[PDB]
Enzyme design. Structure first.
Site, PDB file in Angstrom:
ATOM      1  N   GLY A  85       0.704  -1.180   0.115  1.00 30.58           N
ATOM      2  CA  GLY A  85      -0.062  -0.053   0.068  1.00 30.58           C
ATOM      3  C   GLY A  85       0.754   1.327   0.023  1.00 30.58           C
ATOM      4  N   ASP A 102      13.658 -13.981   0.757  1.00 28.87           N
ATOM      5  CA  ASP A 102      13.867 -12.783  -0.276  1.00 28.87           C
ATOM      6  C   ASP A 102      14.706 -11.915   0.075  1.00 28.87           C
ATOM      7  OD1 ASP A 102      12.973 -12.214  -2.685  1.00 28.87           O
ATOM      8  OD2 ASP A 102      11.477 -10.705  -2.051  1.00 28.87           O
TER       9      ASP A 102
END
Length: 292
Positions: free
Chosen positions: A31, A138
Site C-alpha cells: 500500500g 527474499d
C-alpha cells in the site's frame, strides 16, 4: 475468514488512531508508504498504510508483524507499532535515511573492505533468524536498508518461513528469481541456506552492479540458475583470493557444503571489513544520485 483476520489483527495492534502519535506525513510510495515523525520521541518513521479490502493475502501481513515483533535484532529494521482503523492497517517501522544497498551498488563502486562489512552485518541478521528457525526467503539488495552512518539492516518479512525440526524444509517458491537458490526449483525441499545463496548473489551485485542474468526474462534466468549452477564472475582475477573463497562458500551448488550463517561469520573475508562509517560517502553519493 475476513472477519477472523480482522479480529486477529485487532488483537495485535495498538489501540486508536495513529494520527495522534505521528506528524509530518510525506508520501514516498504507492500500500501507501509515508515518512513521518513520532511526536513523542522525535524519531523519524516509515509508515505503510494498507486498505485490507484490497489486500489479497492478509495472513502474510499478520505473519510479517508477528515475526518482526518476536525477532528484534540490531541488523533488522525495527518494527515499532501497528494500528487498525476500520479496514485501514498501519505498520510503523524505523526510517533509515540512507536508502538501500541497491542504490549504493547501482550508483557507486564498493571496495572489498566495504563489501566485507556489509556481508558481515547481513550474516549477523541471518544467523539470528536461522537460529530462531526463520528463513527470510527474499534476500536481495532492495531489502537491505542503510543508515546515513553506514548501519546495515534487513527488511521485508512478507515472504519469510518459520520451520521446525519435524518440518525443517519448505517448498513454496516465493523469492525473487535472480537471487533464488537453484534447489528451490530443482527440488521441493529447501532450508535456511537459500538465504546464504541469495547473500552470495548480493555480493555479486556489490562487485558488478547487478545479479547474474538480470537482462534475462525471470523465467529464463531461473532455468539458467538451475542448469548452470554456481554463477561465474566477469573478472574473478580482480578479486582477492579470500573474497573468491567466500563467494564459493555462499554459492556452492551442494547445499551441505554451502556455508551456514554461523560458519560464514568466522570466514577470514569478513576480517578485512572496514568500519561501517566507511560506507557513509557512498551512501551520500547514491542518495544524491537517486533523489529524482
Amino acid at each position: 475468514s475476513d472477519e477472523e483476520i480482522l479480529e486477529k489483527l485487532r488483537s495485535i495492534v495498538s489501540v486508536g488512531d495513529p494520527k495522534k502519535k505521528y506528524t509530518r506525513f510525506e508520501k514516498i510510495g504507492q500500500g501507501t508508504v509515508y515518512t513521518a515523525m513520532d511526536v513523542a520521541t522525535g524519531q523519524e518513521v516509515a509508515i505503510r498504510q494498507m486498505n485490507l479490502q484490497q489486500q489479497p493475502k492478509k495472513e502474510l501481513i499478520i505473519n510479517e508483524i508477528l515475526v518482526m515483533r518476536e525477532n528484534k535484532n540490531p541488523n533488522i529494521v525495527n518494527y515499532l507499532d501497528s494500528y487498525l482503523v476500520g479496514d485501514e492497517l498501519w505498520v510503523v517501522m524505523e526510517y533509515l535515511a540512507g536508502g538501500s544497498l541497491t542504490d549504493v551498488v547501482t550508483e557507486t563502486c564498493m571496495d572489498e573492505g566495504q563489501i566485507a562489512a556489509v556481508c558481515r552485518e547481513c550474516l549477523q541478521a541471518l544467523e539470528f533468524l536461522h537460529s530462531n528457525q526463520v528463513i527470510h526467503r527474499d534476500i536481495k539488495s532492495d531489502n537491505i536498508l542503510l543508515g546515513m552512518d553506514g548501519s546495515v539492516k534487513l527488511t521485508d518479512f512478507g515472504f519469510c518461513a518459520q520451520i521446525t525440526p519435524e518440518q525443517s524444509k519448505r517448498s513454496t517458491m516465493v523469492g525473487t528469481p535472480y537471487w533464488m537458490a537453484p534447489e528451490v526449483v530443482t527440488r521441493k525441499a529447501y532450508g535456511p541456506k537459500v538465504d546464504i545463496w541469495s547473500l552470495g548473489i548480493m555480493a555479486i551485485e556489490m562487485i558488478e552492479g547487478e545479479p547474474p542474468y538480470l537482462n534475462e526474462n525471470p523465467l529464463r534466468a531461473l532455468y539458467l540458475i538451475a542448469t548452470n549452477g554456481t554463477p561465474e564472475l566477469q573478472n574473478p582475477e580482480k578479486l582477492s583470493a579470500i573474497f573468491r573463497d567466500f563467494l564459493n562458500r555462499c554459492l556452492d551448488m551442494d547445499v551441505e557444503k554451502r556455508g551456514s550463517a554461523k560458519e560464514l561469520l568466522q570466514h577470514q573475508f569478513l576480517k578485512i571489513a572496514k568500519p561501517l562509517s566507511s560506507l557513509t560517502p557512498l551512501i551520500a553519493a547514491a542518495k544524491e544520485a537517486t533523489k529524482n
